[PDB]
Write an enzyme that holds these catalytic residues in place. Structure first.
Site, PDB file in Angstrom:
ATOM      1  N   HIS A  56     -32.067  12.211 -19.721  1.00  0.00           N
ATOM      2  CA  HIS A  56     -33.205  11.354 -19.327  1.00  0.00           C
ATOM      3  C   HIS A  56     -32.566  10.194 -18.602  1.00  0.00           C
ATOM      4  O   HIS A  56     -31.522   9.653 -18.968  1.00  0.00           O
ATOM      5  CB  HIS A  56     -33.941  10.881 -20.581  1.00  0.00           C
ATOM      6  CG  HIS A  56     -34.411  11.996 -21.463  1.00  0.00           C
ATOM      7  ND1 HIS A  56     -35.657  12.528 -21.402  1.00  0.00           N
ATOM      8  CD2 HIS A  56     -33.754  12.739 -22.412  1.00  0.00           C
ATOM      9  CE1 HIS A  56     -35.818  13.502 -22.255  1.00  0.00           C
ATOM     10  NE2 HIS A  56     -34.633  13.651 -22.911  1.00  0.00           N
ATOM     11  N   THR A 106     -38.412  14.518 -28.178  1.00  0.00           N
ATOM     12  CA  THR A 106     -38.940  13.349 -27.431  1.00  0.00           C
ATOM     13  C   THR A 106     -39.865  13.755 -26.304  1.00  0.00           C
ATOM     14  O   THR A 106     -40.352  12.864 -25.573  1.00  0.00           O
ATOM     15  CB  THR A 106     -37.808  12.477 -26.851  1.00  0.00           C
ATOM     16  OG1 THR A 106     -37.150  13.193 -25.811  1.00  0.00           O
ATOM     17  CG2 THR A 106     -36.858  12.010 -27.940  1.00  0.00           C
ATOM     18  N   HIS A 135     -39.480  18.508 -15.738  1.00  0.00           N
ATOM     19  CA  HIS A 135     -39.429  17.328 -16.574  1.00  0.00           C
ATOM     20  C   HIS A 135     -38.014  16.728 -16.591  1.00  0.00           C
ATOM     21  O   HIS A 135     -37.817  15.524 -16.700  1.00  0.00           O
ATOM     22  CB  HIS A 135     -39.940  17.649 -17.990  1.00  0.00           C
ATOM     23  CG  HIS A 135     -41.328  18.234 -18.014  1.00  0.00           C
ATOM     24  ND1 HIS A 135     -42.458  17.489 -17.741  1.00  0.00           N
ATOM     25  CD2 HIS A 135     -41.761  19.488 -18.292  1.00  0.00           C
ATOM     26  CE1 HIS A 135     -43.524  18.266 -17.837  1.00  0.00           C
ATOM     27  NE2 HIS A 135     -43.125  19.480 -18.176  1.00  0.00           N
ATOM     28  N   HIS A 188     -28.669  14.584 -23.979  1.00  0.00           N
ATOM     29  CA  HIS A 188     -29.090  15.259 -25.182  1.00  0.00           C
ATOM     30  C   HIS A 188     -28.502  16.658 -25.196  1.00  0.00           C
ATOM     31  O   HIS A 188     -28.829  17.508 -24.406  1.00  0.00           O
ATOM     32  CB  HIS A 188     -30.622  15.363 -25.270  1.00  0.00           C
ATOM     33  CG  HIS A 188     -31.250  14.043 -25.515  1.00  0.00           C
ATOM     34  ND1 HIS A 188     -32.575  13.793 -25.248  1.00  0.00           N
ATOM     35  CD2 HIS A 188     -30.745  12.883 -25.962  1.00  0.00           C
ATOM     36  CE1 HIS A 188     -32.855  12.538 -25.544  1.00  0.00           C
ATOM     37  NE2 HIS A 188     -31.765  11.958 -26.004  1.00  0.00           N
ATOM     38  N   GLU A 242     -33.572   6.802 -23.857  1.00  0.00           N
ATOM     39  CA  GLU A 242     -34.675   6.927 -24.788  1.00  0.00           C
ATOM     40  C   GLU A 242     -34.421   6.087 -26.029  1.00  0.00           C
ATOM     41  O   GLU A 242     -35.211   5.213 -26.392  1.00  0.00           O
ATOM     42  CB  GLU A 242     -34.875   8.404 -25.125  1.00  0.00           C
ATOM     43  CG  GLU A 242     -35.269   9.206 -23.885  1.00  0.00           C
ATOM     44  CD  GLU A 242     -36.085  10.432 -24.184  1.00  0.00           C
ATOM     45  OE1 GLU A 242     -35.617  11.291 -24.960  1.00  0.00           O
ATOM     46  OE2 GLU A 242     -37.186  10.571 -23.645  1.00  0.00           O
ATOM     47  N   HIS A 276     -29.428  18.330 -21.501  1.00  0.00           N
ATOM     48  CA  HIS A 276     -30.211  17.722 -20.383  1.00  0.00           C
ATOM     49  C   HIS A 276     -30.035  16.233 -20.538  1.00  0.00           C
ATOM     50  O   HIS A 276     -29.467  15.715 -21.510  1.00  0.00           O
ATOM     51  CB  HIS A 276     -31.716  18.095 -20.444  1.00  0.00           C
ATOM     52  CG  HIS A 276     -32.346  17.647 -21.697  1.00  0.00           C
ATOM     53  ND1 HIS A 276     -32.287  18.413 -22.849  1.00  0.00           N
ATOM     54  CD2 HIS A 276     -32.913  16.471 -22.074  1.00  0.00           C
ATOM     55  CE1 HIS A 276     -32.843  17.759 -23.839  1.00  0.00           C
ATOM     56  NE2 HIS A 276     -33.264  16.586 -23.372  1.00  0.00           N
TER      57      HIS A 276
HETATM   58 ZN   LIG Z   1     -34.038  14.939 -24.386  1.00  0.00          ZN
END
Ligand SMILES: [Zn+2]
Ligand SMILES: [Zn+2]
Lengths: 259, 259
Positions: free
Chosen positions: A95, A197, A63, A118, A105, A93
């Site tokens: 996004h 999230t 992911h 994050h 996000e 990590h």
């Molecule tokens: Zn995250």
């Protein structure tokens, strides 16, 4: 078998089928409207204590990719700001998007950044992460926007190992990484109560989103887009657009630490 | 590794360490004080529909033994009483003592029975058991006291297979079992909102406890006591006193369906 992702059939619009909290009252991320996210003079400065952080490994989980830390002691902690007590760093990590114009996000007055970092912390009151995630005050996630611009020196150690973890389930040793090198100079922030999230979307997070982005080079973020969601030998699915869009704020207040 | 049981070090008084909801507001079982558990004329009759119940297997899980049912359709369902909608039977099991004078989880005016039968159902509104257990009205457990007395013919099929599942992890095929043979003649009941009586002690249960016990013979319950908590090859730990004691009622109301 249960699966989720960012595709047409298994993506954010469908997560509610297996995870009905997806339609809950405290879901993340959100859009931060600077006209309504009011300065709160009672908010304290954030205390980031990462000088003794001990990174362990980096992993592609299908992911995103996580850099995992030793969270057996208070080596890397978040205190102050909106938090009571001590929150230990367990992993970070990102996004990111398929294009420089999207990937974050959280959004600020609807603006999307190229990526969002994050840094995930859990409240030591609860003994371990697995218990903390079950509590409304269990986690604190420090969110940092990545704006395409100059190269970020402190990111380069991450970028340089990504070719070793291209596919789901791959990991590598990843020691002596300094997470201080991913922070902006200002720790001015917005805060609100929210959620994970990604599934299982648990409403256990005090979100702390920094105003100031860090800059990443176009080449650095292009490296993130070479990762794969899939496992080795499976059809290529490039790891891009692994972001959940803004969710309804509902009754919540976003508070700003700054004027 | 995480473990729990009914012993000195891992028993009910210690469950709160790994499962802090053990000290929660809606924990089960409870003592049913008949002077304060008042008749509620708005309570409907319980509808038990087990004529098509389809049992599959019996399993020693190291804490009790479960008879598992096929819950793919409304073949064995509980409706009415305090319940909204339809609750499907998934399994039944018992709790019991080392002596005839103890073993039940619920008590009635402090009286303990030799054992207690739990028929576990989940609310079809929630799709599957795994989602149902996450909701306050997710499960309905029908509890039935076992009083030592005459042999219960409907129990004998169970007793006759227990030698084949002596130790933790053992299972056997167990088809065509009639759970109607474990019911008393009267379906008068008490009801209150509570929890699983074993870890993870989730507060997801509408408890329906029948007034009338069923009998079981001293020999039938003695057979239950020959089971083992332990696995094959491990030191013998007889499966006895696998009951949680009464927990605080707090502000909850126990309602009676009968005068
Ligand atoms: Zn995250
Ligand atoms: Zn039980």
């Amino acid at each position: 078998s249960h699966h989720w992702g960012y595709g047409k059939h298994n993506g954010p619009e469908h997560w509610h089928k297996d995870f009905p909290i997806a339609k809950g009252e405290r879901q993340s991320p959100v859009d931060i409207d600077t006209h309504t996210a009011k300065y709160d003079p009672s908010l304290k400065p954030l205390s980031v204590s990462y000088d003794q952080a001990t990174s362990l490994r980096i992993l592609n989980n299908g992911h995103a990719f996580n850099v995992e830390f030793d969270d057996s002691q208070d080596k890397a902690v978040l205190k102050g700001g909106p938090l009571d007590g001590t929150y230990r760093l367990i992993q970070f990590h990102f996004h990111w998007g398929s294009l420089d114009g999207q990937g974050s996000e959280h959004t600020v007055d609807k603006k999307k950044y190229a990526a969002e970092l994050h840094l995930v912390h859990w409240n030591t009151k609860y003994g371990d992460f697995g218990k903390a995630v079950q509590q409304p005050d269990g986690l604190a996630v420090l969110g940092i926007f990545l704006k395409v611009g100059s190269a970020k020196p402190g990111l380069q150690k991450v970028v340089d190992v990504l070719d070793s973890i291209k596919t789901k389930g791959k990991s590598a040793d990843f020691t002596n990484f300094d997470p201080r090198g991913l922070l902006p100079e200002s720790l001015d922030y917005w805060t609100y109560p929210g959620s994970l999230t990604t599934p299982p979307l648990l409403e256990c997070v005090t979100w702390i989103v920094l105003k100031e982005p860090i800059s990443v080079s176009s080449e650095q973020v292009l490296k993130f887009r070479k990762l794969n969601f899939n496992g080795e030998g499976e059809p290529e699915e490039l790891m891009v657009d692994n972001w959940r869009p803004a969710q309804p704020l509902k009754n919540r207040q976003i508070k700003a630490s700054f004027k």
